[PDB]
Amino acid sequence: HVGTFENITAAPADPILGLADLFRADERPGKVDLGVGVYKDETGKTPVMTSVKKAEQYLLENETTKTYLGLDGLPEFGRCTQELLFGKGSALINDKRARTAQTPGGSGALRVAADFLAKNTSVKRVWVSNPTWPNHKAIFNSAGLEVREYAYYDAENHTLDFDALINSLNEAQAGDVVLFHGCCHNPTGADPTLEQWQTLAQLSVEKGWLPLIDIAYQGFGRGLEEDAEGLRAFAAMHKELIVASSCSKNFGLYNERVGACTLVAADSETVDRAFSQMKAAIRANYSSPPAHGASVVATILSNDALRAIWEQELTDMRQRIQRMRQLFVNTLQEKGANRDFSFIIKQNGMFSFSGLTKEQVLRLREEFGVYAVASGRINVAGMTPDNMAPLCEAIVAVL
Amino acid sequence: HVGTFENITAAPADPILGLADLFRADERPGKVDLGVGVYKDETGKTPVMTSVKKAEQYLLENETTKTYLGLDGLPEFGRCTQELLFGKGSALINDKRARTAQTPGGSGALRVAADFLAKNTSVKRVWVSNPTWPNHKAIFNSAGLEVREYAYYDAENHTLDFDALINSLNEAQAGDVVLFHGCCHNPTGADPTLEQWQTLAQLSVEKGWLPLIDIAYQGFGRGLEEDAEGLRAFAAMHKELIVASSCSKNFGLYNERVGACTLVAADSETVDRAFSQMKAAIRANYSSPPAHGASVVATILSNDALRAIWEQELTDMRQRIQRMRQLFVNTLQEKGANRDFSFIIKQNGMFSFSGLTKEQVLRLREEFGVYAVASGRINVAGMTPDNMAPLCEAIVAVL
Numbered sequence: 001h002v003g004t005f006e007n008i009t010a011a012p013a014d015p016i017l018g019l020a021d022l023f024r025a026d027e028r029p030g031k032v033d034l035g036v037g038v039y040k041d042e043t044g045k046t047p048v049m050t051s052v053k054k055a056e057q058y059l060l061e062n063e064t065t066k067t068y069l070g071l072d073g074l075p076e077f078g079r080c081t082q083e084l085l086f087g088k089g090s091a092l093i094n095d096k097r098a099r100t101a102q103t104p105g106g107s108g109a110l111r112v113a114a115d116f117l118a119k120n121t122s123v124k125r126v127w128v129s130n131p132t133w134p135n136h137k138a139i140f141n142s143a144g145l146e147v148r149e150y151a152y153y154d155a156e157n158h159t160l161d162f163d164a165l166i167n168s169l170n171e172a173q174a175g176d177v178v179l180f181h182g183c184c185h186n187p188t189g190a191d192p193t194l195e196q197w198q199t200l201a202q203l204s205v206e207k208g209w210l211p212l213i214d215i216a217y218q219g220f221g222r223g224l225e226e227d228a229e230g231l232r233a234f235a236a237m238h239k240e241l242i243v244a245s246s247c248s249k250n251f252g253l254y255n256e257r258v259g260a261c262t263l264v265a266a267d268s269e270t271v272d273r274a275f276s277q278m279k280a281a282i283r284a285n286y287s288s289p290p291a292h293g294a295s296v297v298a299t300i301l302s303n304d305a306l307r308a309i310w311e312q313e314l315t316d317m318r319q320r321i322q323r324m325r326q327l328f329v330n331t332l333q334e335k336g337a338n339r340d341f342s343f344i345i346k347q348n349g350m351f352s353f354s355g356l357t358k359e360q361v362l363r364l365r366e367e368f369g370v371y372a373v374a375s376g377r378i379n380v381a382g383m384t385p386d387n388m389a390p391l392c393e394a395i396v397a398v399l
Numbered sequence: 400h401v402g403t404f405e406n407i408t409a410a411p412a413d414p415i416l417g418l419a420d421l422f423r424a425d426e427r428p429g430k431v432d433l434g435v436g437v438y439k440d441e442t443g444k445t446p447v448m449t450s451v452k453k454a455e456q457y458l459l460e461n462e463t464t465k466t467y468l469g470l471d472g473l474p475e476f477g478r479c480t481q482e483l484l485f486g487k488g489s490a491l492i493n494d495k496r497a498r499t500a501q502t503p504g505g506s507g508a509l510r511v512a513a514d515f516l517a518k519n520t521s522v523k524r525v526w527v528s529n530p531t532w533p534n535h536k537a538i539f540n541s542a543g544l545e546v547r548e549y550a551y552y553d554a555e556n557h558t559l560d561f562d563a564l565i566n567s568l569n570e571a572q573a574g575d576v577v578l579f580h581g582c583c584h585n586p587t588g589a590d591p592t593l594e595q596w597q598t599l600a601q602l603s604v605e606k607g608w609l610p611l612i613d614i615a616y617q618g619f620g621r622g623l624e625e626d627a628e629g630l631r632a633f634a635a636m637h638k639e640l641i642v643a644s645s646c647s648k649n650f651g652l653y654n655e656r657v658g659a660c661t662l663v664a665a666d667s668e669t670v671d672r673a674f675s676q677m678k679a680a681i682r683a684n685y686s687s688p689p690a691h692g693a694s695v696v697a698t699i700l701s702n703d704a705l706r707a708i709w710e711q712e713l714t715d716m717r718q719r720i721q722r723m724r725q726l727f728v729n730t731l732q733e734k735g736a737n738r739d740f741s742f743i744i745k746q747n748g749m750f751s752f753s754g755l756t757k758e759q760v761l762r763l764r765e766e767f768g769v770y771a772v773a774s775g776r777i778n779v780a781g782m783t784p785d786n787m788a789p790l791c792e793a794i795v796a797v798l
Binding site for chain 1: 400402403404405407408409410416436437444445446447451452455456459462463464465466467468469502503504506507510514519520521522534537538540541573574607609638639647651652653654655656662664665669670671672673675676678679680682683684685686687688689690691692
């Protein structure tokens with residue numbers, strides 16, 4: 001009997017992992033990695049947030065069991081998530097139209113949503129922005145759902161091309177899912193304005209789309225409440241939606257895998273039926289979600305003092321990113337960049353497309369030790385006041 | 400437009416969750432829940448193990464980041480898992496034939512294995528024992544794999560009917576997966592002897608099956624090394640196999656979701672190809688696994704002092720279960736049971752089938768506040784020296 005594994009073709013190597021290996025091995029003291037995928041502070045560290053350490057100490061001192069929770073995880077975490085998303089006092093919450101399952105990250109939320117849709121609805125297609133989070137396609141395709149792209153970013157002019165977006169979505173059919181990033185669009189940082197969100201929400205009702213809001217950076221754009229405006233505009237207008245949320249970034253809990261999938265339906269009975277089937281999708285996967293990260297989040301959010309410490313930290317991170325965006329633009333100018341980069345201070349979150357070509361990206365790495373991913377995506381949290389001048393001089397040199 | 404969720408039918412209610420509801424609403428002081436699915440100590444608690452609290456303190460003191468790990472999780476956890484499974488001095492490990500992905504529980508391991516097999520191999524069918532762990536069918540079916548049942552337990556006579564088992568497996572074709580519980584068969588507690596494992600391993604080689612060993616109770620049967628004998632009998636004989644392992648029960652880490660999927664192939668280059676595609680299946684699911692529980696396990700297993708504290712606790716847990724099995728049988732006899740329950744003494748792990756009818760189970764709950772599941776499965780860890788006499792009196796009364 002030939003082996004079952006004998007003829008498996010290897011998956012393609014992950015180019016980003018390859019770059020990370022090269023960076024690690026690079027002995028040049030001037031090296032900088034703008035290709036990283038997480039927040040870093042001014043010292044280049046991704047620390048554990050103080051509020052998180054305090055919560056972890058409280059859990060250590062008070063947890064008396066690790067017995068299983070249900071398929072939806074920790075109820076307090078679900079309620080805290082819903083309040084962050086919709087606002088405490090939301091008519092949606094008051095009307096009992098939402099149910100939330102804690103999941104292993106936003107990634108887990110997306111897969112659970114995909115499996116739920118594929119097994120229980122007539123959804124055939126999920127529409128995602130061009131560009132979008134790289135992992136969206138694989139997740140939805142794994143559930144047998146087709147993924148189509150809609151127009152979003154104008155790369156030459158560095159804008160969200162809203163008219164192109166709405167026209168391209170005329171191809172989406174009633175009952176298709178259309179996925180929108182809630183804030184800090186990844187990787188462009190180009191977000192709809194509130195008025196644009198309101199236009200999209202109205203269009204979505206008219207066309208019969210099922211919106212799926214992927215929100216992974218609440219608090220990184222303009223603030224917690226502001227960053228939820230787009231989601232809340234959809235929530236005001238729709239009978240149904242799905243939200244995939246993550247606490248990986250805004251709580252610095254990346255490796256603990258903390259996020260949620262929230263269903264909204266027209267009434268309590270409907271959302272309960274749908275949620276029962278979502279649970280079934282979870283039961284066929286990992287069953288119950290990982291407790292530690294969700295416990296941490298619930299511990300912080302339910303305590304006024306800890307919550308204040310967390311909010312201040314998150315504010316500090318948002319403001320550092322904004323400072324680096326401003327400093328990057330000003331430093332490119334002082335280093336004599338031969339074109340305008342002001343789009344950088346019109347974008348939200350830690351990611352933007354630099355507008356550099358793959359050739360310029362390669363040259364930056366080989367000649368200057370400045371690392372970015374092939375798409376030209378850069379993470380401004382990889383910038384500091386101390387590394388800004390040489391990295392801008394390098395960029396200017398390849399333009 | 401009509402709702403996408405409007406015509407979703409509710410999943411059928413989970414009878415066990417309902418029984419847990421009824422238990423909570425039952426105000427009678429003498430209630431005993433033999434229907435639980437986790438370990439409990441002599442006080443009725445599911446404690447955090449001492450070794451686990453110590454490891455958690457160490458992590459709180461020493462962790463400086465929660466940045467993402469890779470798709471396979473914490474390397475040290477993978478190595479420690481492989482050593483527990485295959486033993487020191489494993490030729491298989493020396494030959495670099497194994498790769499392990501940390502996963503969200505044994506459940507996550509089974510789903511990752513299922514998705515990997517469905518997308519990368521010609522496997523069409525997975526064979527499981529009648530009875531088996533309740534979630535096996537849903538997990539494999541979710542990946543598009545047919546699940547077939549093989550003979551295992553003679554309920555009237557309380558035996559592993561080995562001849563029925565091997566004859567029933569003549570229907571399994573070359574290339575099919577056959578799933579075996581590594582130890583403490585759930586829910587019968589009836590395990591193959593070493594000689595029987597060796598016979599199964601030889602048959603598997605002859606027939607060309609791909610074995611999947613699901614091991615979730617290592618340490619609860621006879622002890623860590625003994626409980627791995629069956630797996631190791633297969634390992635010695637096979638070019639390829641899959642192991643889904645769990646630390647939920649033997650580290651009391653249920654809600655942290657810590658387990659692993661281990662692939663074994665003929666050689667290192669082959670297992671690397673296979674594992675690359677397993678990582679792709681993970682990427683399309685929840686991406687990286689939850690760190691906390693795996694960090695705890697690695698911390699314990701890689702430190703001699705902590706490991707000894709863990710092993711001692713686990714031994715105490717195993718021995719308490721064995722003592723309750725003996726005490727149950729002896730108390731039933733002293734209370735005048737009209738039937739022999741000696742089969743209980745021999746069975747391994749926390750679960751056995753009581754042999755009680757559904758009518759007897761109903762009466763036990765309604766009249767005596769003794770709770771078992773409809774099948775008559777009991778968890779002997781729900782028994783204590785203090786509750787044993789009333790429990791046995793109730794059972795004798797319904798016989």
